[PDB]
Amino acid sequence: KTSFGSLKDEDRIFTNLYGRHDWRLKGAQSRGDWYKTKEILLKGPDWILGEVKTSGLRGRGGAGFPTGLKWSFMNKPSDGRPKYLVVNADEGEPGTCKDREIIRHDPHKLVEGCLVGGRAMGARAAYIYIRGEFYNEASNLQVAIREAYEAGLIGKNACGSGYDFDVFVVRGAGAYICGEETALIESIEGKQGKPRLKPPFPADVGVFGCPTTVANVETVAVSPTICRRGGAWFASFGRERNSGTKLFNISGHVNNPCTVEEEMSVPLKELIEKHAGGVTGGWDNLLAVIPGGSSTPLIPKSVCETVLMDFDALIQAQTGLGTAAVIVMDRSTDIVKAIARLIEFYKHESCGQCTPCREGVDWMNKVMARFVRGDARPAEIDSLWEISKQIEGHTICALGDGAAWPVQGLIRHFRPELEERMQRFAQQHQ
Amino acid sequence: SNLIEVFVDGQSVMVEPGTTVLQACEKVGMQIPRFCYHERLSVAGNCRMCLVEIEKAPKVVAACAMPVMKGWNILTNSEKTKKAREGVMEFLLANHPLDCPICDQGGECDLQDQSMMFGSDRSRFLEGKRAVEDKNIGPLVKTIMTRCIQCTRCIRFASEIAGVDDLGTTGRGNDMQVGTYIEKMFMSELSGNIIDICPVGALTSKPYAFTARPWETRKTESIDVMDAVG
Amino acid sequence: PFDNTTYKNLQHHDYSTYTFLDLNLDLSKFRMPQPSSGRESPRH
Amino acid sequence: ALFVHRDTPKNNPETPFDFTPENYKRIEAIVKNYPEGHKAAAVLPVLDLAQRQNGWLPISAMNKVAEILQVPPMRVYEVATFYTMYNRKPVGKYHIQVCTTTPCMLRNSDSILEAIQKKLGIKVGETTPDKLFTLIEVECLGACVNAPMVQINDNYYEDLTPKDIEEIIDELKAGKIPKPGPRSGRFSCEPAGGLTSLTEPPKGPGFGVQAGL
Numbered sequence: 001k002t003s004f005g006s007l008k009d010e011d012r013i014f015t016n017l018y019g020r021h022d023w024r025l026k027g028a029q030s031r032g033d034w035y036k037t038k039e040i041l042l043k044g045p046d047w048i049l050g051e052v053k054t055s056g057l058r059g060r061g062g063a064g065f066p067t068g069l070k071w072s073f074m075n076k077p078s079d080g081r082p083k084y085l086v087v088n089a090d091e092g093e094p095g096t097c098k099d100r101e102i103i104r105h106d107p108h109k110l111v112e113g114c115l116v117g118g119r120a121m122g123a124r125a126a127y128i129y130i131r132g133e134f135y136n137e138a139s140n141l142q143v144a145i146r147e148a149y150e151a152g153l154i155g156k157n158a159c160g161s162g163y164d165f166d167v168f169v170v171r172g173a174g175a176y177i178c179g180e181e182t183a184l185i186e187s188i189e190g191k192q193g194k195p196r197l198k199p200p201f202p203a204d205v206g207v208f209g210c211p212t213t214v215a216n217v218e219t220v221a222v223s224p225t226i227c228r229r230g231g232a233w234f235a236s237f238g239r240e241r242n243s244g245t246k247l248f249n250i251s252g253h254v255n256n257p258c259t260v261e262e263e264m265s266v267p268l269k270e271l272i273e274k275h276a277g278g279v280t281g282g283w284d285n286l287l288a289v290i291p292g293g294s295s296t297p298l299i300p301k302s303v304c305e306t307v308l309m310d311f312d313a314l315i316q317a318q319t320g321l322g323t324a325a326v327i328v329m330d331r332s333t334d335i336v337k338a339i340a341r342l343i344e345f346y347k348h349e350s351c352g353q354c355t356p357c358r359e360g361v362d363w364m365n366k367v368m369a370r371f372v373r374g375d376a377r378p379a380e381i382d383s384l385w386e387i388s389k390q391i392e393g394h395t396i397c398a399l400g401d402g403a404a405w406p407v408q409g410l411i412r413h414f415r416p417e418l419e420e421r422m423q424r425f426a427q428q429h430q
Numbered sequence: 431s432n433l434i435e436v437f438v439d440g441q442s443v444m445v446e447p448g449t450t451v452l453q454a455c456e457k458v459g460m461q462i463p464r465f466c467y468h469e470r471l472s473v474a475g476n477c478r479m480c481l482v483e484i485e486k487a488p489k490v491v492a493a494c495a496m497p498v499m500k501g502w503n504i505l506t507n508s509e510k511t512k513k514a515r516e517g518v519m520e521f522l523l524a525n526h527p528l529d530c531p532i533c534d535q536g537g538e539c540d541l542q543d544q545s546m547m548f549g550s551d552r553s554r555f556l557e558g559k560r561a562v563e564d565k566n567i568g569p570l571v572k573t574i575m576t577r578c579i580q581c582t583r584c585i586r587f588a589s590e591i592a593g594v595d596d597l598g599t600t601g602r603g604n605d606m607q608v609g610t611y612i613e614k615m616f617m618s619e620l621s622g623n624i625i626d627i628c629p630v631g632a633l634t635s636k637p638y639a640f641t642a643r644p645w646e647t648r649k650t651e652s653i654d655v656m657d658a659v660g
Numbered sequence: 661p662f663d664n665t666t667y668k669n670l671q672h673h674d675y676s677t678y679t680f681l682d683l684n685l686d687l688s689k690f691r692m693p694q695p696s697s698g699r700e701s702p703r704h
Numbered sequence: 705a706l707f708v709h710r711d712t713p714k715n716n717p718e719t720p721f722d723f724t725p726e727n728y729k730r731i732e733a734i735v736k737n738y739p740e741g742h743k744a745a746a747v748l749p750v751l752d753l754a755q756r757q758n759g760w761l762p763i764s765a766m767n768k769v770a771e772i773l774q775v776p777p778m779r780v781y782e783v784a785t786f787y788t789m790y791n792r793k794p795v796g797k798y799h800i801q802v803c804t805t806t807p808c809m810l811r812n813s814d815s816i817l818e819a820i821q822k823k824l825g826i827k828v829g830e831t832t833p834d835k836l837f838t839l840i841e842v843e844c845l846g847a848c849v850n851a852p853m854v855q856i857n858d859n860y861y862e863d864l865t866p867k868d869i870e871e872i873i874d875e876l877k878a879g880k881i882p883k884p885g886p887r888s889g890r891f892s893c894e895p896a897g898g899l900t901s902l903t904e905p906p907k908g909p910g911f912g913v914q915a916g917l
């Protein structure tokens with residue numbers, strides 16, 4: 001199979017994504033949820049891990065780490081401490097709104113994924129860390145958890161399998177840095193949401209010092225479907241090491257901004273022109289696309305023609321898949337102002353613990369503000385490139401890389417526009 | 431023996447398990463620069479000055495917190511270690527105030543010394559610096575928080591040794607500040623050691639203020655007789 | 661009857677300020693006892 | 705926007721504050737959600753509950769949280785100052801937050817911001833003289849495909865136009881709470897031009913199950 005896309009409705013994991021059916025237990029149970037869960041819980045942890053790692057599922061958070069190895073890191077005998085599965089439902093990355101849909105419309109899929117994942121690695125409980133702004137989504141999740149508890153699906157003797165498992169929901173307080181896994185762990189513990197240093201990895205020391213595995217909502221909600229349908233069915237879609245389906249949020253200067261599930265190796269042009277109704281003013285009006293939210297470098301129109309939205313082909317286009325959040329900017333957009341707003345967002349959302357991000361991101365914010373005004377010189381463009389290279393790779397967490405990358409992409413693909421801006425400011429203001 | 435073998439600049443050294451990169455480099459006489467690491471405090475790892483390069487590894491690691499495994503080669507004077515040191519020094523000196531003649535840490539400042547030794551020689555900062563509101567924590571310690579580098583030795587000392595838990599960090603991003611958030615006097619029996627462990631002139635001795643300079647003082651090693659500890 | 665022309669997530673229009681908290685308080689009976697670290701607090 | 709506290713008659717440590725008994729039971733449930741020996745992990749939800757009861761956080765809820773959780777007050781001060789959802793100043797009854805991040809900026813959110821500004825007669829960061837509205841500008845809120853959008857307290861108002869946000873403000877001034885949803889033709893996140901996916905009925909239980917399970 002060389003061409004990918006045009007996924008049928010029978011192969012979609014996230015049915016009732018748009019909320020057109022019942023989100024409660026009665027409607028979810030008629031859609032295949034909570035079916036034969038006792039069999040998966042009784043087939044052992046290693047069988048679940050083998051089913052996960054045969055499908056080749058990679059982490060949907062944005063790092064793209066393989067899920068089977070990451071989950072099997074906690075398949076070790078316990079030393080008296082409990083083990084915890086922690087679900088990252090923060091979703092603070094701009095352009096990304098898939099986890100809100102998953103929580104709001106399919107909560108029982110998330111609960112079943114929590115139970116199956118906790119059985120796969122011997123977790124004592126589950127801690128769902130939802131965004132603090134998602135009050136209604138958190139209340140819907142609490143209602144569904146109550147319905148699952150009252151039906152005997154979780155709790156003491158969960159699903160009649162002899163396994164004890166609790167699901168908890170913890171609400172955040174409005175911090176984008178708390179989406180980082182170690183910062184999430186620190187925020188659950190009642191501290192400031194500042195990330196830790198690795199090693200120790202969360203499988204060794206995590207929440208409360210216990211072994212902990214932090215997993216995304218999307219990579220958890222698909223696990224019962226993986227164990228039920230099979231790993232080969234999930235691996236039948238996408239390329240090598242890019243298996244399965246993916247939720248895309250198409251937004252920006254597009255006709256129909258929407259969230260839609262699609263095959264992993266779908267072309268970007270086909271995805272945009274099919275699901276979102278095309279960009280405004282036709283395909284020739286496209287100017288730039290950010291494929292993975294604000295943490296990924298942007299690509300111009302000449303690259304989006306022949307690119308595929310998986311991990312490897314987007315890596316080879318010197319960008320990343322990210323969270324599969326496609327932000328589209330047409331020719332009526334100031335690209336410098338958009339990237340400056342992104343850097344301003346990164347300056348506002350930065351924990352300030354470690355030196356290079358804390359100083360340098362504000363430095364880049366000031367430099368890009370002067371770039372938007374045009375009050376600079378090309379020597380400052382090369383200086384900003386060097387500063388971005390100095391920030392990246394020298395920080396505790398990956399927010400510094402996520403703030404360095406968009407500037408590098410903007411410089412690399414739109415240096416003539418910036419130079420024209422500063423030269424017209426110099427010739428107008430003097 | 432449980433000792434493992436590592437290499438510092440190609441020189442073999444036997445280290446105990448649990449040893450950090452910094453202590454292994456200290457075992458052969460190399461002192462990696464630090465701003466937040468203290469040997470009598472917990473490891474924070476936020477100043478990022480100790481970023482050293484391990485060979486056959488495409489990422490610099492924080493030497494104050496990274497444990498060494500066997501077969502590792504540490505390059506303390508390679509090109510990218512020096513590049514990381516220069517970048518971190520530039521970021522530290524980006525927002526620092528130009529207060530060296532009017533500051534008591536001059537001549538004994540760690541920031542001055544390992545900016546001269548490991549940093550660059552000029553500034554590319556073409557913006558305006560920040561200013562932080564000063565605080566009052568007692569008649570003993572003079573506080574000028576514009577000079578603070580957010581090294582968080584304050585909180586680690588006051589929580590792990592003095593056991594007071596009055597100092598902390600309030601804010602986020604570049605607006606993050608070190609303080610008590612209220613008009614509280616940090617009055618303990620071990621308060622001047624926060625003057626001692628501050629690497630910059632942010633916390634100074636108020637009785638000693640504006641009196642001498644460190645290069646002109648003659649040092650005599652003696653014994654305290656104020657109590658029976660000796 | 662298959663209906664996909666209506667929005668079935670209309671329950672959140674009647675949620676109050678305390679709904680999450682009373683949901684947690686009612687859920688508190690089903691939950692299992694928590695593990696203990698042996699001391700009241702790390703500062704103890 | 706100051707991260708230091710100065711004593712005022714309105715905000716002093718002697719300002720009266722205490723939880724209601726039902727809130728004490730809720731605090732007990734929150735504490736029971738956590739392992740023993742780690743009672744300090746409940747600093748965030750109890751502080752949020754105090755803000756929900758009071759509407760803002762003076763320095764009497766912080767000390768009360770430190771007292772009922774046996775944690776130092778400095779840690780509660782750090783928690784309150786780090787996160788942006790906690791209000792250390794008294795905001796109005798309706799706290800309007802307008803997202804101006806780039807995916808919302810591309811869909812003309814500044815038009816919504818100036819519409820609110822000329823409807824209320826204030827600017828960003830200010831409060832109406834009758835203490836009913838507060839207008840601030842925030843980062844992304846996880847509704848980027850429904851841009852432009854605002855958040856009023858717990859509710860999300862999405863796909864807004866200047867006329868729609870003016871209608872929301874006028875209805876809020878009358879005392880009636882609007883429906884927290886997109887004001888366009890779509891319901892939650894579907895494409896406006898019909899359903900391009902999930903148009904079939906779901907297959908149901910036992911569909912595609914592998915053998916041996």
Ligand SMILES: NC(=O)C1=CN([C@@H]2O[C@H](COP(=O)(O)OP(=O)(O)OC[C@H]3O[C@@H](n4cnc5c(N)ncnc54)[C@H](O)[C@@H]3O)[C@@H](O)[C@H]2O)C=CC1
Pocket residue numbers: 060061062063064065070073091092093096179180181201202214295296320322323397398402
């Ligand atoms: N989803 C979102 O909202 C956002 C996603 N991102 C993306 O997230 C990524 C950065 O996130 P991180 O988790 O910090 O980076 P990633 O490099 O570290 O790590 C992913 C996971 O693999 C584990 N891991 C990796 N190597 C390991 C090893 N040798 N031993 C044990 N565990 C190991 C880590 O513990 C972590 O849980 C980037 O790709 C960025 O684009 C960035 C911003 C927002």
Ligand SMILES: Cc1cc2nc3c(=O)[nH]c(=O)nc-3n(C[C@H](O)[C@H](O)[C@H](O)COP(=O)(O)O)c2cc1C
Pocket residue numbers: 058059060061062063064065070088089090091092093176177178179180181182214215216217219397398399
């Ligand atoms: C600044 C920052 C913010 C992040 N925010 C989120 C987030 O909101 N949701 C998420 O799932 N992962 C987020 N991540 C990625 C996590 O660190 C981690 O990779 C993820 O929670 C779990 O990865 P997985 O997809 O393999 O399970 C963030 C990372 C960083 C550096």
Ligand code: SF4
Pocket residue numbers: 177195349350351352353354355357358395396397398399400
């Ligand atoms: S890179 Fe920024 S957000 Fe991440 S740990 Fe450092 S200061 Fe915090």
Ligand code: SF4
Pocket residue numbers: 526527528529530533534535536537539540541542577629630631632
């Ligand atoms: S603390 Fe050091 S670098 Fe800063 S003003 Fe004083 S002597 Fe100069």
Ligand code: SF4
Pocket residue numbers: 577578579580581582583584585608624627628629630632633
């Ligand atoms: S005042 Fe000094 S010791 Fe305290 S955090 Fe700042 S630099 Fe470190």
Ligand code: FES
Pocket residue numbers: 463464465466467474475476477478479480481492493494495
């Ligand atoms: S000495 Fe290691 S990061 Fe500061």
Ligand code: FES
Pocket residue numbers: 094095096803804805806807808843844845846847848851853
């Ligand atoms: S960018 Fe505005 S909700 Fe995400």
Ligand SMILES: [K+]
Pocket residue numbers: 535625626627628629630631632633634
């Ligand atoms: K000092």
